[PDB]
């Protein structure tokens, strides 16, 4: 197979321009197709060969001679912030790479720890939930039950339509017999030059 | 005060760059649009139809515009040639240039092949009319036409020898597909096509400079005639004659079969025969055999008459066209069939011109009043040989699109190779058989009445 | 126009076999290679291609796992998936342009190869007691095997996180940034009859 590689899985673009790059593992002879998939929709063909469009908006252009290809969105609007895929059509085994556009925002994370309720503690469980509702970038969550823990499950949404900020919920599942370790703390590490710690005892 | 050998040589050399562009386009434009320009074969069918068809249309229109050209300070035909060469070379270079257009390369190519047809038409129709202006002696015009025929055959040989050996020198990688499942670049192939087109454009210019310097028009102003598309009763008079029609329909169908072969033999050599690297050598061997078989058929039309010459000359390619699609792509079989196909090409494009003066004498015997019947016969043949070959090439590339022609490809599916076998083996044999059946219905019966018509030439 | 209509989402149970159909409209199906793709959470993969009047060509990873078939009397192309367990994905059937190798039209049908069928449990996770400005309330939905729908009575500040697998069931959480707190409740709708709405109390 041919190792088609889109390096940036996430890109930042607001209204100016976007250059989505695709590096092939082989000289493919200017045979690269560009698809656009929106969430909840199948992929739609944008470009094929070097720069040939297929019934799409004129902002989508493409370039690349061999082993390095680019798709330019010179007019990036709200529908243009979706996932894009570069495909080879040089050899029989077809391969894709994966990429996505995002807007640009500021900074500032949040954190809020929530203990298990009485209803969950009645039916043999204890889930401590750390909500991280608004931030921009990449964030990490550390759970400390007076010791590091690696039994928590994390979930992230996409980027919000209004605030243009991400979110994160981390759930720590602990049984009733293991529910005496001291205090539970949730630590958030973003680009804010310091972790934000919430705790409950 | 006749034409020198240098003036006839310059007039002859001025007709070569053309044949060169005709052989380059007619042998390599389909594979350029399909494999090098990376077009959809529907768009390639559109371009290959519209360039030839529109071309044929412009031929009588530029003939009419040339026939009303007044006498300038340089001549009646030299201003058209001189003012239309530097635009024709630009359009010819931009035919084989692949543009960086995000949508609609078909519009770019459609513009050039067609514009080139107009421009070249504006170069060639005054050039064809120049034979009536170079000299007032009919023997001088016949010697200049013989020189022109020799340099046209040589430029037919050179045009597949420069483009073929330049664009075949630098190859390109091929595109595997699902049927294929279980350092040279594409840009180097495009650069080779640009280099070949630049060499052909340099030849064009050089020969246009030679034609401008070495040929004068003598300011005769002692004759007048009609124009193309001004009248159409002469075409009905020619088509009302029996042998004239029979000859034009036979030569038509035969030229249609061999133009279909010329258009679609490059793809047959690349994919069916597995000769993606050495198809240009096969085309060069075909052109060398067609060049070397012309004195053979010139001796054959005198040794054994002309009825058997056109009966077996145009049908000698039939078992070899069966054999190329009935063997599993052997190299020696390909080369011997290339030699036989070149011999048949030389026969089919030489021997109707040997048949023609007998029909001219028969028409002079039938009609004492004759003016421009040969010119309107050749104009009718040309247009059709152009329009119907454009139809054939468009139908061929559209059938490739329907069959699922992978661009480049390294292996075509069984549907595409069957269409190539039909397009080089079924349809040209059918057109050759139809042309032979038209040649059977021939009331002139070679010289056996035509010499009696020559006695009619002694009568009038 | 040219379009491809598939079947609905399917839920095979562990090691069943799942047949995904793809009915074509607007072109002769015997002329084009009808493909079959594989979109995981990561990216797009490529199972195989099928010529409806001829051969089937597989990827080496999917030989023995996939089985492409073509019914040309019903303009239909089908993919049969054998043993599963991690083939929870979205399968497309976008056919190929006969000349190029790219896919003009496309498809989309989910496959969720898991086991179990249970009603969700709703827990009103609330604040510990501290307060500074706006309050953050929560709702934890744990232990179901379908797609839920979480709601709040006319308040638009909610973030409903994507569900995740834990064991054989799904876990989901929802957060609301509400300034004033007279009364807040969390509504959960479900495919089964589990429309339970729970109020969020203090402490
Ligand atoms: C194994 C099979 C081999 C197959 C084919 C070989 C084929 C060549 C066919 C013909 C050339 C004949 C060469 C001798 C001169 C005869 C006149 C002639 O060559 O053809 C007359 C004309 O009627 C066709 O004109 P054409 O359209 O081809 O050229 C125009 C160029 N352009 C398109 C740019 C305007
Ligand atoms: C895409 C390219 C298409 C082809 C390009 C052709 C453009 C040039 C057209 C020129 C064709 C002939 O051009 C036209 O010839 C006639 C000849 O009677 C000239 O007509 C004039 O000149 C002659 C000579 O004095 C007089 O006898 C005549 O009475 C007078 O009307 C026109 O002044 C000229 O415009
Ligand atoms: C590239 C596409 C174009 C291909 C064709 C290009 C050449 C076309 C034929 C050349 C004729 C040029 O156009 C010509 O110009 C001169 C000067 O205006 C005029 O020609 C006239 O000029 C003088 C003065 O009247 C007289 O000798 C005579 O009446 C006539 O020759 C006409 O207008 C036209 O005959
Ligand atoms: C004897 C030979 C002499 C030849 C000398 C002439 C120079 C030849 C060099 C090629 C120059 C043309 O180059 C070509 O021009 C067209 C102009 O529309 C460009 O096309 C450009 O404009 C069109 C709009 O019309 C856009 O749709 C297209 O996206 C854009 O790329 C091509 O991108 C470029 O590749
Ligand atoms: C002699 C035949 C000449 C044919 C030339 C005109 C054909 C009809 C023109 C329709 C072109 C429509 O397609 C247009 O092509 C140009 C490229 O040049 C693109 O730019 C446009 O985005 C596209 O809309
Ligand atoms: C880019 C292309 C490069 C081409 C290089 C140039 C090639 C050189 C051309 C030489 C061709 C010689 O052309 C030669 O002319 C004489 C005329 O005197 C002909 O000789 C014959 O002509 C006619 C036959 O129709 C008779 O009327 C005449 O009696 C007889 O002499 C020869 O049959 C022909 O072969
Ligand atoms: C009189 C004026 C007209 C002159 C026209 C020019 C005629 C001379 C053409 C140039 C000579 C090229 O001739 C051609 O060269 C190539 C080599 O590159 C040969 O090709 C040969 O070598 C290749 C190796 O790649 C093999 O496929 C095979 O051994 C053989 O086909 C052809 O057999 C020969 O026909
Ligand atoms: C009008 C000019 C008359 C010239 C007649 C002779 C020209 C012969 C053309 C030969 C083609 C030249 O092209 C070159 O040939 C050599 C030898 O094969 C190779 O090198 C490549 O194929 C190519 O770069
Ligand atoms: C009248 C008789 C005519 C005989 C033939 C005359 C021309 C013969 C062609 C020989 C030159 C081409 O041979 C070889 O081609 C490749 C292109 O594929 C060139 O490669 C280069 O081409 C051009 C040169 O500016 C560059 O833009 C390009 O980046 C580079 O690839 C080589 O430098 C050359 O050595
Ligand atoms: C006797 C006189 C005739 C002698 C030969 C004259 C022919 C001149 C053609 C020479 C070939 C020039 O070819 C040159 O190569 C480079 C290779 O990157 C190409 O440049 C190309 O690079 C990339 C490729 O995707 C693109 O940005 C774009 O298509 C183009 O700029 C051009 O095609 C041309 O600028
Ligand atoms: C008579 C014998 C001589 C024949 C050859 C004479 C012409 C030689 C030129 C051949 C190569 C042409 O190469 C071609 O040049 C044009 C610029 O003009 C470039 O065209 C490009 O120019 C610039 C960037 O450079 C941009 O506006 C745009 O991307 C495009 O239009 C192409 O990238 C290249 O493919
Ligand atoms: C680049 C190649 C082009 C080189 C230039 C062309 C040279 C060949 C042209 C032939 C020279 C003139 O040929 C003849 O000479 C005498 C005296 O001048 C003229 O009297 C004739 O009308 C002319 O036919
Ligand atoms: C006198 C005028 C000309 C008359 C003769 C011209 C037609 C000759 C009839 C040939 C039979 C046509 O029938 C056609 O043959 C090809 C053979 O590859 C077959 O084509 C089928 O089989 C091949 C494999 O063998 C597959 O690769 C292909 O995808 C599939 O379409 C079908 O059976 C049918 O589509
Ligand atoms: C009437 C004209 C007589 C011409 C005879 C040859 C006709 C050629 C048409 C295509 C026939 C070949 O057809 C092809 O060959 C094999 C037999 O090996 C079979 C299949 O049908 C097809 O894939
Ligand atoms: C004088 C000429 C006589 C005929 C003129 C007819 C010209 C009509 C213009 C073509 C418009 C429709 O053209 C037809 O539709 C589809 C989509 O619309 C085109 O597009 C098709 O091929 C392209 C490849 O380039 C694919 O990217 C695309 O997915 C596919 O649908 C084809 O080019 C053609 O099959
Ligand atoms: Na033509």
Domain limits, chain B: 1-226, 231-460
DSSP one-letter code for C73: T
Burial of B353 (0-12, 13-18, 19+ CB in 10 A): exposed
Count contacts between A and C (CB, < 8 Å). 121
Answer yes or no: are the C-beta atoms of B350 and B292 closer than 8 Å: no
Which two tokens mark C15?
């090691």
Phi/psi at C92 (5° precision): -110, 160
Nearest to B237 by CA among B61, B372, B358: B372
CATH architecture of C121-200: Sandwich (2.60)
Beta-carbon contacts of residue A21 (< 8 Å; ≥ 6 apart)? A6, A7, A8, A68, A69, A70
Beta-carbon contacts of residue C122 (< 8 Å; ≥ 6 apart)? C139, C140, C141, C186, C188, C196, C198
Q: Under DSSP, is residue C71 helix (H, G, I), strand (E, B) or coil?
A: strand
Residues A28 and A77 in one domain: yes
Which two tokens mark B18?
């053309």
CATH architecture of B231-460: Up-down Bundle (1.20)
Which two tokens mark C42?
């990561």
Answer yes or no: are the C-beta atoms of B247 and B82 closer than 8 Å: no
Q: Cβ of B134: how many Cβ atoms within 10 Å?
A: 21
CA distances from B308 to B204, B301, B339, B350, C197 (A): 39, 9, 20, 14, 100
As a whole number of angstroms, the distance between CA A183 and CA A127 comes to 14
As a whole number of angstroms, the distance between CA A117 and CA B272 comes to 76
Residues A24 and A114 in one domain: no
Which two tokens mark C8?
């609905």
Residue showing tokens 């468009």: B394
- Helix residue ranges per DSSP H, B318-330: 318-324
Give me ligand 14 centre to Cα B40, in Å.
27
Phi/psi at B239 (5° precision): -70, -20
Query: Which domain covers residue A125, as residue numbers?
Result: 106-201
Query: How many CA atoms within 13 Å lie on the side-chain side of B302?
Result: 5
Protein residues with C-beta less than 5 angstroms from the ion ligand 16:
B 52, 55
Residues A96 and A7 in one domain: yes
Q: Cβ of B289: how many Cβ atoms within 10 Å?
A: 20
As a whole number of angstroms, the distance between CA A38 and CA A17 comes to 19
Cα dihedral B306, B307, B309, B314 sign: positive
Shared fold status for B1-226 and B231-460: yes
Nearest to B346 by CA among B312, B318, B319, B313: B313
Answer yes or no: are the C-beta atoms of B307 and B446 closer than 8 Å: yes
Among protein residues, the one with the nearest Cα to ligand 9's atom 31 is B188
Q: At what angle do helices B242-267 and B331-366 cross, to 10 degrees?
A: 160
- C141 - beta bridge partners? C122, C172
Nearest to B307 by CA among B346, B341, B353, B355: B355
With contacts defined as CB-CB under 8 Å, which chain A residues touch C128? 113-115, 200
CA distances from A24 to A21, A90, B341 (A): 10, 11, 45
Helix (H) or strand (E) holding C90: strand C89-91
Question: CA-nearest residue of chain B to C101?
Answer: B177
Q: What is the 3-state secondary structure (H, E, C) of B293-320?
A: CHHHHHHHHHHCCCHHHHHHHCCCCHHH
Nearest to B404 among C31, C55, C57 (CB): C31
Residues A98 and A116 in one domain: no
Q: Cβ of C61: how many Cβ atoms within 10 Å?
A: 14
Report yes or no: B170 at the A interface, CB cutoff 8 Å: no
Q: Which residues in chain C are classed under CATH 2.60.40.10?
A: 3-111, 121-200
Q: Under DSSP, is residue A101 helix (H, G, I), strand (E, B) or coil?
A: strand
Answer yes or no: are the C-beta atoms of B75 and B444 closer than 8 Å: no
CA dihedral B194, B196, B198, B199 (to 10 degrees): 170
Answer yes or no: are the C-beta atoms of B219 and B73 closer than 8 Å: no
**Distance, C-alpha B260 to centroid of its chain:** 11
Best to test chain C binding among B177, B180, B400, B405 (most C CBs inside 10 Å): B177
Q: Cβ of B435: how many Cβ atoms within 10 Å?
A: 23
- Flag if A92 and B185 touch (Cβ within 8 Å): no
Q: What is the 3-state secondary structure (H, E, C) of C117-176?
A: CCCCEEECCCCCCCCCCCEEEEEEEEEECCCCEEECCCCCCEEECCCEEECCEEEEEEEE
Number of helices (H), then strands (E), belonging to chain C: the values are: 0, 17
Query: What is the distance in angstroms between the Cα of B35 and the nearest Cα belonging to chain C?
Result: 11
List, edge to edge, every strand of the sheet that includes A184-189. A148-149, A140-144, A184-189, A196-200
What is the length of chain A? 201
Beta-carbon contacts of residue B246 (< 8 Å; ≥ 6 apart)? B438, B439, B441, B442, B443
Ranges of beta strands (E only) in chain A are 11-12, 18-22, 32-37, 43-48, 52-53, 60-63, 69-73, 83-88, 99-102, 112-114, 127-135, 140-144, 148-149, 152-155, 166-173, 184-189, 196-200
- A21 - beta bridge partners? A70
Query: What is the distance in angstroms between the Cα of B176 and the nearest Cα belonging to chain A?
Result: 4
CATH architecture of B1-226: Up-down Bundle (1.20)
What is the length of chain B? 460
Q: Cβ of B418: how many Cβ atoms within 10 Å?
A: 16
- A19 - beta bridge partners? A72
DSSP assignment of C178-190 equals ES--S-EEEEEE-
Backbone dihedral region of C113: left (phi > 0), alpha (psi from -120 to 50 degrees) or beta? beta
Answer yes or no: are the C-beta atoms of B50 and B390 closer than 8 Å: yes
DSSP one-letter code for B71: P
Answer yes or no: are the C-beta atoms of B128 and B82 closer than 8 Å: no
Beta-carbon contacts of residue B127 (< 8 Å; ≥ 6 apart)? B14, B15, B18, B77, B81, B211
As a whole number of angstroms, the distance between CA A130 and CA A112 comes to 6
Answer yes or no: are the C-beta atoms of B339 and B289 closer than 8 Å: yes
As a whole number of angstroms, the distance between CA B194 and CA B398 comes to 26
Report yes or no: A56 at the C interface, CB cutoff 8 Å: no
CA distances from B262 to B23, B257, B287, B303, B345 (A): 9, 9, 11, 30, 10
Answer yes or no: are the C-beta atoms of C3 and C105 closer than 8 Å: yes
Q: How many degrees, rounded to 5, is the angle at CA A119 between CA A113 and CA A124?
A: 95
Residues A84 and A8 in one domain: yes
Cα dihedral B191, B196, B200, B205 sign: positive
Which residues surround ligand 15 with Cβ inside 6 Å?
Answer: A 48, 54; B 40, 42, 46, 50; C 97, 104
Q: Which ligand is nearest to the CA of B415?
A: 13
With contacts defined as CB-CB under 8 Å, which chain A residues touch C199? none
Among protein residues, the one with the nearest Cα to ligand 9's atom 24 is B191
Helix (H) or strand (E) holding C110: strand C109-111
Phi/psi at B34 (5° precision): -85, -50
Cα dihedral B125, B127, B131, B133 sign: positive
Residues A79 and A152 in one domain: no
- Flag if A65 and B183 touch (Cβ within 8 Å): no
**Distance, C-alpha C13 to centroid of its chain:** 15
Nearest to A129 among C44, C138, C160 (CB): C138
CA distances from C19 to B137, B144, C16, C45 (A): 85, 77, 10, 18
As a whole number of angstroms, the distance between CA B315 and CA B435 comes to 10
DSSP assignment of B364-404 equals HHH-S--SSHHHHHHHHHHHHHHHHHHHHHHHHHHHHHHHT
List, edge to edge, every strand of the sheet that includes A18-22. A18-22, A69-73, A60-63
Residues of B numbered 28-87 whose beta carbons fall under 8 angstroms of chain C's beta carbons: which are they?
40-41
Query: How many CA atoms within 13 Å lie on the side-chain side of C39?
Result: 19
Residues A72 and A136 in one domain: no
Answer yes or no: are the C-beta atoms of B26 and B85 closer than 8 Å: no
Q: Which ligand is nearest to the CA of B288?
A: 7
Phi/psi at A85 (5° precision): -135, 130
Give me ligand 3 centre to Cα C35, in Å.
63
As a whole number of angstroms, the distance between CA B297 and CA B313 comes to 8
As a whole number of angstroms, the distance between CA B47 and CA B25 comes to 12
Nearest to A66 by CA among A49, A42, A91: A49
As a whole number of angstroms, the distance between CA B105 and CA B121 comes to 24
Phi/psi at C66 (5° precision): -110, 155
Cα dihedral B281, B284, B288, B290 sign: positive
With contacts defined as CB-CB under 8 Å, which chain B residues touch A53? 102-103
Residues A110 and A29 in one domain: no
Q: Under DSSP, is residue A45 helix (H, G, I), strand (E, B) or coil?
A: strand
Report yes or no: C1 at the A interface, CB cutoff 8 Å: no
Q: Cβ of A115: how many Cβ atoms within 10 Å?
A: 18
Nearest to B407 by CA among A81, A148, C100: C100
DSSP assignment of B27-58 equals HHHHHIIIIIS---HHHHHHHHHHHHHHHHHH
As a whole number of angstroms, the distance between CA B15 and CA B226 comes to 24
- Helix residue ranges per DSSP H, B215-330: 233-240, 242-267, 279-292, 294-303, 307-313, 318-324
Nearest to A102 by CA among A73, A145, A131: A73
Residues A162 and A180 in one domain: yes
Answer yes or no: are the C-beta atoms of B227 and B375 closer than 8 Å: no
Backbone dihedral region of B104: left (phi > 0), alpha (psi from -120 to 50 degrees) or beta? left
As a whole number of angstroms, the distance between CA A95 and CA A50 comes to 17
Which two tokens mark A35?
């698809």
Percentages of chain B per state (helix, strand, coil), in multiples of 5: 75, 0, 25
Q: How many degrees, rounded to 5, is the angle at CA B268 between CA B265 and CA B273?
A: 130
DSSP one-letter code for B405: -
As a whole number of angstroms, the distance between CA C186 and CA B290 comes to 89
Answer yes or no: are the C-beta atoms of B383 and B248 closer than 8 Å: no
Answer yes or no: are the C-beta atoms of B110 and B44 closer than 8 Å: no
Answer yes or no: are the C-beta atoms of C93 and C107 closer than 8 Å: yes
Residue showing tokens 């597995």: B274
* Chains touching C by CB (3 or more pairs below 8 Å): A, B
Burial B293-315 (b: 16+ CB within 10 A, else e): bbeebeebbeeeebbebbeebbb
Answer yes or no: are the C-beta atoms of B51 and B400 closer than 8 Å: no
Q: Cβ of B333: how many Cβ atoms within 10 Å?
A: 16
Q: What is the resolution of this structure in A?
A: 3.3
DSSP assignment of B148-210 equals HHHHHHHHHHHHHHHHHHHHTTS-------TTT-----HHHHHHHHHHHHHHHHHHHHHHHHH
As a whole number of angstroms, the distance between CA C78 and CA B262 comes to 43
Which two tokens mark B344?
């048949």
Give me ligand 13 centre to Cα B258, in Å.
24
Which two tokens mark B68?
């009303």
Residue B197 CA, closest ligand 11 atom number: 4
Which two tokens mark B205?
């210019």
Q: Are strands A11-12 and A99-102 parallel, antiparallel or unpaired?
A: parallel
Residue showing tokens 């109390």: C201
As a whole number of angstroms, the distance between CA C201 and CA C181 comes to 10
Answer yes or no: are the C-beta atoms of B124 and B208 closer than 8 Å: no
Give the residues after which the backbone of chain C is interrupted, taking a C-to-next-N distance over 2.5 angstroms as a break: none
DSSP one-letter code for A26: S
Which two tokens mark B459?
């009568």
Phi/psi at B56 (5° precision): -60, -40
Residues A145 and A100 in one domain: no
Residue showing tokens 């059938």: B399
Give me ligand 6 centre to Cα B154, in Å.
12
Domain C3-111 part of CATH 2.60.40.10: yes
**Number of domains observed in the structure of chain A:** 2
Helix (H) or strand (E) holding C47: strand C44-51
Boundary (domain end) residue, out of A58, A89, A105: A105
Helix (H) or strand (E) holding C6: strand C3-6
CA distances from B279 to B269, C75, C180 (A): 6, 40, 83
Phi/psi at A131 (5° precision): -100, 135
How was this structure determined? It was done by cryo-EM
Residues A75 and A138 in one domain: no
Query: How many CA atoms within 13 Å lie on the side-chain side of B434?
Result: 14
Give the residues after which the backbone of chain A is interrupted, taking a C-to-next-N distance over 2.5 angstroms as a break: none
Residues A59 and A9 in one domain: yes
As a whole number of angstroms, the distance between CA B49 and CA B42 comes to 11
As a whole number of angstroms, the distance between CA A125 and CA C142 comes to 11
Q: Under DSSP, is residue A157 helix (H, G, I), strand (E, B) or coil?
A: coil
């Amino acid at each position: 197979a041919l190792d088609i590689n889109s390096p940036e899985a996430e890109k930042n673009a607001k209204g100016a321009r976007a250059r989505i790059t695709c590096n092939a593992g082989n000289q493919v002879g200017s045979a690269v197709a560009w698809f656009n998939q929106r969430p909840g929709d199948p992929a739609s063909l944008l470009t094929y060969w070097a720069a040939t469009e297929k019934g799409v908006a004129g902002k989508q252009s493409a370039q690349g001679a061999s082993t390095k290809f680019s798709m330019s969105s010179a007019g990036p609007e709200a529908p243009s912030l979706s996932s894009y895929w570069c495909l080879l059509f040089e050899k029989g085994a077809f391969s894709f790479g994966g990429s996505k556009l995002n807007p640009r925002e500021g900074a500032g994370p949040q954190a809020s720890i929530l203990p298990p309720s009485a209803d969950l503690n009645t039916s043999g469980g204890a889930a401590v939930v750390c909500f991280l509702p608004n931030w921009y970038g990449n964030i990490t969550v550390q759970w400390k039950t007076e010791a590091p823990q690696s039994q928590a499950n994390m979930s992230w949404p996409g980027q919000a339509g209004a605030n243009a900020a991400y979110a994160m919920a981390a759930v720590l599942a602990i049984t009733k017999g293991d529910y005496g370790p001291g205090s539970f703390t949730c630590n958030a590490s973003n680009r804010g030059t310091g972790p934000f710690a919430m705790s409950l005892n | 005060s006749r034409l020198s050998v240098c003036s006839k040589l310059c007039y002859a050399i001025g007709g070569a760059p053309y044949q060169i562009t005709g052989c380059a386009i007619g042998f390599f434009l389909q594979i350029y649009l399909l494999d090098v320009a990376l077009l959809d074969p529907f768009y390639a069918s559109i371009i290959l139809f519209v360039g030839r068809a529109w071309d044929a249309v412009t031929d009588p229109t530029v003939g009419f515009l040339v026939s009303r050209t007044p006498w300038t300070r340089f001549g009646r035909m030299m201003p058209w040639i001189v003012l239309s060469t530097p635009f024709a070379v630009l359009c010819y270079f931009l035919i084989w240039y692949v543009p960086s257009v995000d949508q609609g390369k078909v519009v770019w190519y459609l513009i050039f092949y067609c514009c080139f047809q107009t421009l070249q038409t504006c170069f060639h129709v005054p050039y064809s009319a120049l034979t009536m202006f170079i000299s007032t002696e009919q023997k001088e015009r016949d010697s200049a036409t013989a020189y022109r025929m020799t340099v046209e055959v040589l430029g037919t040989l050179i045009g597949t020898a420069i483009q073929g050996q330049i664009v075949g020198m630098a190859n390109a990688p091929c595109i595997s597909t699902e049927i294929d499942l279980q350092h040279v670049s594409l840009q180097d192939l495009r650069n080779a096509y640009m280099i070949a087109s630049g060499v052909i454009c340099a030849i064009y210019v050089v020969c246009a400079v030679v034609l401008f310097l070495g040929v004068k028009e003598q300011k005769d102003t002692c004759r007048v005639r009609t124009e193309p598309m001004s009248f159409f009763q002469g075409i009905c008079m020619v088509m009302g004659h029996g042998p004239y029609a029979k000859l034009v329909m036979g030569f038509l169908f035969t030229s249609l079969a061999f133009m279909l072969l010329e258009g679609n033999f490059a793809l047959f050599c690349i994919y069916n025969l597995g000769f993606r690297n050495d198809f240009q050598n096969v085309l060069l061997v075909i052109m060398l055999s067609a060049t070397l078989a012309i004195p053979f058929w010139q001796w054959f039309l005198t040794k054994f008459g002309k009825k058997t010459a056109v009966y077996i000359g145009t049908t000698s390619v039939v078992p070899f066209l069966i054999s190329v699609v009935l063997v599993p792509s052997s190299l020696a079989v390909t080369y011997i069939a290339s030699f036989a196909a070149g011999v048949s090409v030389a026969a089919a494009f030489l021997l109707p011109w040997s048949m023609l003066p007998d029909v001219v004498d028969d028409f002079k015997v039938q009609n004492p009043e004759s003016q421009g019947h040969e010119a309107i016969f050749y104009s009718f043949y040309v247009f059709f040989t152009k329009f119907a070959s454009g139809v054939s090439l468009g139908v061929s590339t559209l059938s490739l699109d329907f069959a699922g022609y992978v661009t480049r490809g390294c292996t075509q599916p069984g549907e595409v190779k069957l269409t190539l076998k039909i397009l080089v083996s079924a349809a040209p044999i059918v057109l050759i058989i139809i042309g032979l059946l038209i040649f059977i219905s021939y009331p002139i019966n070679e010289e056996k009445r035509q010499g009696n018509r020559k006695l009619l030439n002694e009568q009038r | 126009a040219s379009k491809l209509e598939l079947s609905g989402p399917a839920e095979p149970r562990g090691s069943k076999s799942a047949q995904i159909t793809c009915k074509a409209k607007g072109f002769p199906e015997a002329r084009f290679w009808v493909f079959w793709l594989f979109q995981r959470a990561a990216a797009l993969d490529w199972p195989a291609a099928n010529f409806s009047g001829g051969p089937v060509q597989f990827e080496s990873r999917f030989q023995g796992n996939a089985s492409l078939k073509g019914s040309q009397a019903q303009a239909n192309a089908e993919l049969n998936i054998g043993a599963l367990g991690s083939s929870t994905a979205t399968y497309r059937c976008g056919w190929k342009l006969a000349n190029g190798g790219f896919f003009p039209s496309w498809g989309g049908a989910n496959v969720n190869g898991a086991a179990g069928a249970k009603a969700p449990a709703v827990y009103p996770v609330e604040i510990s007691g501290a307060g500074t400005g706006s309050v953050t309330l929560g709702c934890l939905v744990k232990g179901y095997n379908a797609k839920p729908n979480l709601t709040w009575p006319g308040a638009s500040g909610a973030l409903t996180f994507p569900s995740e697998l834990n064991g054989a069931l799904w876990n989901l959480a929802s957060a609301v940034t509400g300034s004033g707190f007279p009364s807040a409740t969390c509504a959960v709708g479900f495919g089964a009859a589990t429309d339970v709405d729970k109020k969020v109390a203090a402490a």
